[PDB]
Write a protein that holds these residues in place. Structure first.
Motif, PDB file in Angstrom:
ATOM      1  N   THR A   1       0.864  -1.053   0.337  1.00 12.02           N
ATOM      2  CA  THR A   1      -0.028  -0.175  -0.049  1.00 12.02           C
ATOM      3  C   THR A   1       0.827   1.016   0.033  1.00 12.02           C
ATOM      4  N   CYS A   2       2.305   1.343  -0.254  1.00 15.87           N
ATOM      5  CA  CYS A   2       3.073   1.933   0.290  1.00 15.87           C
ATOM      6  C   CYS A   2       2.804   2.943  -1.681  1.00 15.87           C
ATOM      7  N   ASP A   3       3.939   4.743  -1.358  1.00 14.90           N
ATOM      8  CA  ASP A   3       3.489   5.276  -2.482  1.00 14.90           C
ATOM      9  C   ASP A   3       4.709   5.845  -2.367  1.00 14.90           C
ATOM     10  N   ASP A   4       5.470   6.165  -3.875  1.00 15.91           N
ATOM     11  CA  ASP A   4       6.319   6.675  -3.949  1.00 15.91           C
ATOM     12  C   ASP A   4       6.547   8.177  -4.191  1.00 15.91           C
ATOM     13  N   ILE A   5       7.581   9.483  -3.116  1.00 16.09           N
ATOM     14  CA  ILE A   5       7.205  10.683  -3.666  1.00 16.09           C
ATOM     15  C   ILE A   5       7.894  11.186  -4.907  1.00 16.09           C
ATOM     16  N   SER A   6       9.463  10.997  -4.010  1.00 11.70           N
ATOM     17  CA  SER A   6      10.081  11.692  -4.717  1.00 11.70           C
ATOM     18  C   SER A   6      10.414  10.946  -6.762  1.00 11.70           C
ATOM     19  N   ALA A   7       9.564   9.929  -6.922  1.00  5.13           N
ATOM     20  CA  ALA A   7       9.355   9.508  -8.415  1.00  5.13           C
ATOM     21  C   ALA A   7       8.794  11.129  -9.371  1.00  5.13           C
ATOM     22  N   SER A   8       8.969  10.626 -10.657  1.00  7.40           N
ATOM     23  CA  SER A   8       8.087  11.596 -11.596  1.00  7.40           C
ATOM     24  C   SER A   8       9.007  13.208 -10.733  1.00  7.40           C
ATOM     25  N   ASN A   9       7.987  13.965 -10.662  1.00 10.54           N
ATOM     26  CA  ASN A   9       8.993  15.224 -10.779  1.00 10.54           C
ATOM     27  C   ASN A   9       9.934  15.584  -9.264  1.00 10.54           C
ATOM     28  N   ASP A  10      11.268  15.946  -9.459  1.00  7.96           N
ATOM     29  CA  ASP A  10      11.697  16.490  -8.232  1.00  7.96           C
ATOM     30  C   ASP A  10      10.895  17.911  -7.177  1.00  7.96           C
TER      31      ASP A  10
ATOM     32  N   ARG B   1      10.571  17.896  -3.343  1.00  3.87           N
ATOM     33  CA  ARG B   1      10.531  18.776  -2.412  1.00  3.87           C
ATOM     34  C   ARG B   1       9.569  19.919  -1.457  1.00  3.87           C
ATOM     35  N   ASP B   2       8.192  19.420  -2.491  1.00  3.67           N
ATOM     36  CA  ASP B   2       6.863  20.044  -2.273  1.00  3.67           C
ATOM     37  C   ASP B   2       6.391  19.475  -1.014  1.00  3.67           C
ATOM     38  N   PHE B   3       6.919  17.683  -1.161  1.00  3.73           N
ATOM     39  CA  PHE B   3       6.289  17.059  -0.477  1.00  3.73           C
ATOM     40  C   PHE B   3       6.647  16.735   1.368  1.00  3.73           C
ATOM     41  N   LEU B   4       8.473  17.470   0.745  1.00  2.00           N
ATOM     42  CA  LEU B   4       9.108  16.686   1.949  1.00  2.00           C
ATOM     43  C   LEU B   4       9.161  18.204   2.558  1.00  2.00           C
ATOM     44  N   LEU B   5       8.609  19.362   1.995  1.00  5.37           N
ATOM     45  CA  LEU B   5       8.787  20.223   3.186  1.00  5.37           C
ATOM     46  C   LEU B   5       7.158  20.531   3.380  1.00  5.37           C
TER      47      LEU B   5
ATOM     48  N   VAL C   1      13.373  13.245   7.550  1.00  6.84           N
ATOM     49  CA  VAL C   1      13.369  13.467   6.324  1.00  6.84           C
ATOM     50  C   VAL C   1      15.096  12.588   6.192  1.00  6.84           C
ATOM     51  N   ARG C   2      15.432  11.915   6.969  1.00 11.59           N
ATOM     52  CA  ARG C   2      16.555  10.942   6.026  1.00 11.59           C
ATOM     53  C   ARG C   2      16.011  10.046   5.725  1.00 11.59           C
ATOM     54  N   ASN C   3      14.515   9.435   6.604  1.00  9.73           N
ATOM     55  CA  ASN C   3      14.314   8.422   6.331  1.00  9.73           C
ATOM     56  C   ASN C   3      13.322   8.267   5.071  1.00  9.73           C
ATOM     57  N   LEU C   4      12.953   9.325   4.532  1.00  9.78           N
ATOM     58  CA  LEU C   4      11.956   9.510   3.754  1.00  9.78           C
ATOM     59  C   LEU C   4      13.133   9.466   2.442  1.00  9.78           C
TER      60      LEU C   4
END
Lengths: 528, 519
Positions: free
Chosen positions: A132-141, A145-149, A398-401
């Protein structure tokens, strides 16, 4: 030897008191688990009173002789070093496994059968959550940083940070980007120096590309800024453990002058020893001077005319941060000076902050470094210290992400989905683990019920609500209202937890529950 | 007005003999859950405040420090079980106390303890005769060098968290025992260091010795981390100019002599620094801290140095490169130096670790384990020790009996038949001896969670039917042949256990009085 002052627990009374004592110690951090969790007054052995809701600080502040509770402290110890976030929840999750295990012991189930049950239940819940997990850093970088913020804004909303948190979340994002490269994906918390000072406002907290201390130049008339000096090489900084002056004893002086002979000699020598030590700076070709020992009045005057700023009495650890960032060395004496041992940097200046009398200094680079110093400000002491650990927890988020792109929503949404999957597969096993899987599903339900009790909600009513909304519609993550947002479904509210962080939380908690079940006998002796 | 004691407590009678048994049962009751590889662990808090968790009966019982004099006899046989064999110190204490526990109704009926002790000695003599019949001599028969080590290690590693990854650990288990002399194999010569972090399947085996990388100081990280043939030097004393904590006072009557003493301390150290330089030693090991002047001078000359090296680990360094320790830097002789085949400092475990590797003169090794928690790795460490002790006693002793209760049920079987042939009081005593032998298979099923009623009764059936090798399967609950499942123990275990347990049984039952002098 020493038969007296020795207690032993075995058989019937062992399996009981161990679980009851674990529930009593965990019950303190249960009410403190959440964004709305209640704080705790912790008195240091010196008498200082501190107030924090962090379970890792609670277990560290608690000094107790209970060996069962020491295993809970060792859980938060390994959880803080590996992750540093769910230390409060990993013990509560382990306590839920211990409470359900005690109910299975009263039913006649062997302790290993319970331990083997929680092991197979964990591996089953890992696979269901991994799908059920999803990917963030995929596609736009930039989308990362938007989701990381916005992910840092979630972890900083439970603290006094929440006021200005928009700027503080940017500091945690800009800090991890500087010490990490996209290819390496290695985040070392030692490379980010956590530092803060009282005064001003919290929103003035910034991020420097180099070491920033709080120091005043040895002479007030010295220039506040240090230029590259018209085409020279960087800005040369000198770190020496000896002052520039005629040497003096550090314990007692008492130099008896027998005759005017030695008086006329020491008058001319020491006067000439002034300029000989100042010329050593030009021999090394250095601009900013930093020494472990202070200077005389003439030394500050001679360095004033030569435009050579000096800083006295800098700590040993602070000298190490300068040597790493500026590629410098700690030189023991003045005879070992050279141009390869001096710190190389672009600009050094003393920056003034409002009317504050601190007037700190900044050593810059103007290119990406291997280390940075987190700069924090605040209007009160406790606010500064709380902001330092709040950002430190954000550095762990932010380290684990960046380490694992797979992310899972949280706040009670993940634990319920993990409980619904185990409850369905419990009927297909048809073994003794059928009771262990149902207890494992009820133990996972303790986390959202605990968050509901801290948020002022019915733990039983919310648990059935979290399940019903995830059945009639879809297994998609649906969170809890603890943060007082509009509605459920954290997916719209952007509450994200790392998958690698949640996997280590459900693992070490399951392993500790088994180790307690593996101990049927406790022998405690006196204190020699 | 006169007294017979002055505060010396002495109690005797048949009630004291029974009281001495109850003290041994209390010691036995503590060691019951630790019997077997799946057995429970005891939580011990020493008077030193150090807390340890282990299932090994030797380490456990040595930490109890039982004051009771008769119960101290169980400690003596535990050291004898740890000496002649080294494994099974839990079963020797349980079997010894069970013989005294089953002798309790005999003392109540009025049976003298001499006939009780003599009845066991006759049963042991009949048991030793059966051990020789149950001792199988096998070396190259229906097996080989590598296949025997692999098939036996998979069963020892079975029923563990390493079960799935056991394929990787058996490869290092075979390489560990073959890296040492096959004539004398010592488990202490195989080192195991716990590394926090990383996956459990990524563990590696090192032919040499490793260190803990104690360097917290800046200025490191610039040096080649791979050396071909360095010359390793062992230094017993510290070399430093200005340490990181303490300091020294300079008191003289002149101003120019202030800097002279500061330069004098530099020249005294720089002397000893260039003496190792003239020695030509690329590796510098010291049990004492190495100052900043030495680390900076050795880095410019491309010399690697390691300060504050553990004394116990440096002793294995001597056993690795075949060198020797020297006190000073002046008189160092060539035999003190050593050279290995490779020196590599890796990132293993998300932490830098320096180690020696490929030492041809090494009489010891090091096996690095990885995992998510140090306590789980410690459970793997003791799990590897159990597999080493099996190989250790498989080489030195080629006589093998079937373990896991197989041989235990066979010894008890014939003794029940010997009761029919032996008339008199020895019939009831030997029959109780074989009944007391049933505690070994019982406790194994009670610890792992198996049913003691069904499994033991089903085991007493097919075993008496003419198949002597049926044991108890620890993987899937059922009766089965341990000789096929390859659960093996040497014949010395059954010989030393029955000799030590009966010796502890007869010694305690022969004590009619406990004399305790106060003062």
């Amino acid at each position: 030897k020493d038969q007296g002052n020795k207690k032993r627990q075995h058989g019937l009374e062992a399996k009981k008191s161990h679980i009851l004592a674990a529930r009593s110690v965990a019950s303190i951090i249960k009410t403190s688990l959440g964004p709305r969790g209640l704080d705790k007054i912790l008195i240091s052995p010196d008498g200082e009173i501190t107030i924090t809701n962090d379970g890792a600080t609670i277990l560290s502040q608690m000094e107790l002789d209970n060996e069962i509770a020491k295993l809970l402290v060792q859980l938060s110890k390994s959880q803080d070093d590996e992750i540093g976030d769910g230390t409060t929840g990993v013990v509560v999750l382990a306590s839920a496994l211990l409470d359900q295990a005690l109910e299975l012991i009263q039913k006649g189930i062997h302790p290993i059968k319970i331990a083997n049950g929680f092991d197979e239940a964990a591996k089953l819940a890992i696979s269901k959550l991994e799908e059920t997990c999803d990917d963030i850093s995929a596609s736009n970088d930039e989308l990362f940083r938007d989701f990381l913020l916005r992910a840092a804004k979630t972890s900083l909303g439970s603290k006094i940070v929440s006021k200005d948190h928009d700027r503080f979340a940017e500091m945690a994002v800009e800090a991890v980007i500087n010490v990490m490269d996209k290819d390496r994906k290695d985040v070392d918390f030692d490379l980010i120096k956590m530092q803060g000072r009282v005064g001003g406002s919290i929103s003035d907290s910034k991020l420097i590309n180099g070491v920033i201390l709080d120091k005043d130049f040895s002479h007030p008339q010295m220039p506040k800024c240090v230029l590259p000096k018209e085409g020279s090489d960087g800005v040369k900084l000198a770190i020496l453990t000896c002052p520039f002056e005629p040497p003096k004893p550090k314990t007692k002086h008492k130099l008896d002058i027998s005759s005017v002979e030695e008086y006329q000699k020491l008058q001319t020598y020491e006067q000439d020893k002034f300029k000989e030590m100042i010329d050593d700076v030009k021999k090394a070709g250095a601009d900013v001077v930093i020494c472990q020992w202070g200077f005389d009045d003439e030394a500050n005057h001679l360095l004033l005319q030569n435009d050579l700023p000096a800083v006295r009495w800098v700590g040993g650890q602070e000298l190490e941060h300068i040597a790493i960032s500026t590629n410098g060395r700690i030189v023991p004496r003045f005879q070992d000076l050279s141009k390869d041992k001096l710190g190389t940097c672009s600009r050094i200046y003393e920056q003034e902050f409002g009317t504050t009398k601190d007037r700190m200094l900044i050593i810059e680079q103007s290119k990406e470094t291997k280390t940075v110093t987190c700069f924090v400000r605040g209007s009160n002491k406790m606010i500064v210290d709380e902001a330092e650990r709040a950002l430190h927890d954000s550095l762990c988020v932010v380290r684990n992400l960046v380490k694992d792109s797979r992310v899972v929503y949280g706040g009670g949404a993940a634990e319920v989905t993990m409980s619904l999957a185990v409850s369905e597969e419990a009927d297909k096993q048809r073994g003794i683990d059928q009771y262990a899987f149902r207890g494992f599903a009820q133990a996972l339900d303790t986390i959202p019920m605990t968050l509901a009790e801290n948020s002022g909600l019915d733990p039983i009513g919310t648990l059935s609500t979290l399940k019903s909304k995830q059945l009639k519609e879809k297994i998609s993550n649906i969170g809890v209202d603890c943060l007082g947002y509009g509605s459920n479904d954290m997916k719209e509210l952007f509450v994200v937890d790392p998958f690698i962080g949640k996997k280590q939380q459900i693992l070490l908690a399951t392993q500790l529950c088994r180790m307690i079940l593996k101990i049927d006998n406790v022998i405690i002796s006196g204190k020699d | 007005i006169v007294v017979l004691k002055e505060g010396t407590d002495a109690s005797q009678g048949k009630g004291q003999i029974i009281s001495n048994i109850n003290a041994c049962v209390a010691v036995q009751e503590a060691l019951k859950p630790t019997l077997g590889p799946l057995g429970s662990d005891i939580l011990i808090v020493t008077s030193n405040q150090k807390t340890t968790i282990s299932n090994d009966g030797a380490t456990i019982l040595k930490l109890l420090d039982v004051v009771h004099p008769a119960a101290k006899t169980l400690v003596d046989i535990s050291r004898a079980q740890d000496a002649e064999v080294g494994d099974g110190t839990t079963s020797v204490t349980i079997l010894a106390g069970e013989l005294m526990k089953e002798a309790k109704p005999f003392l109540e009926e009025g049976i003298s303890s001499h006939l009780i002790m003599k009845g066991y000695r006759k049963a042991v003599s009949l048991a030793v005769e059966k051990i020789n019949e149950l001792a199988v001599d096998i070396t190259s028969e229906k097996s080989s060098g590598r296949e025997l080590l692999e098939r036996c290690a998979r069963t020892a590693m079975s029923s563990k968290l390493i079960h799935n990854n056991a394929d990787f650990f058996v490869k290092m288990c075979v390489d560990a025992v073959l890296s040492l002399d096959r004539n004398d194999l010592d488990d202490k010569l195989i080192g195991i260091k716990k590394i926090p972090g990383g996956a459990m399947e990524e563990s590696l085996f090192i032919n040499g010795v490793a260190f803990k990388k104690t360097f917290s100081y800046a200025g490191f990280e610039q040096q080649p981390k791979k050396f071909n043939n360095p010359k390793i030097l062992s230094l017993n004393v510290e070399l430093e100019l200005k340490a990181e904590k303490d300091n020294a006072e300079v008191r003289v009557e002149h101003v120019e002599d202030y800097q002279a003493i500061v330069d004098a301390e530099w020249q005294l150290i720089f002397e000893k620094l260039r003496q190792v330089e003239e020695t030509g030693a690329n590796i510098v090991l010291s049990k004492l801290p190495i100052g900043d002047l030495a680390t900076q001078f050795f880095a410019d000359r491309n010399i690697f140095c390691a300060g504050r090296v553990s004394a116990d680990d440096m002793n294995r360094v001597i056993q690795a490169v075949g060198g020797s320790i020297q006190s000073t830097t002046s008189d160092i002789k060539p035999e003190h130096l050593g050279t290995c085949a490779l020196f590599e400092e890796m990132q293993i475990g998300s932490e830098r670790y320096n180690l020696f590797q490929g030492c041809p003169q090494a009489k010891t090794c090091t096996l690095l384990l990885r995992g998510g928690a140090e306590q789980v790795i410690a459970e793997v460490e003791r799990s590897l020790h159990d597999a080493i002790m099996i190989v250790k006693r498989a080489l030195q002793n080629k006589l093998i009996v079937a373990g896991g209760g197989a041989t235990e049920m066979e010894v008890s079987k014939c003794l029940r038949d010997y009761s029919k042939t032996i008339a008199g009081k020895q019939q009831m005593i030997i029959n109780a001896f074989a009944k007391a032998l049933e505690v070994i298979p019982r406790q194994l099923c009670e610890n792992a969670g198996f049913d003691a009623i069904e499994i033991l009764n089903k085991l007493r059936l097919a075993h008496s039917k003419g198949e002597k090798w049926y044991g108890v399967v620890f993987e899937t609950e059922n009766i089965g042949d341990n000789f096929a499942k390859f659960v093996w123990e040497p014949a010395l275990v059954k010989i030393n256990a029955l000799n030590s347990a009966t010796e502890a049984t007869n010694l305690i039952l022969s004590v009619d009085e406990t004399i305790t002098n106060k003062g």
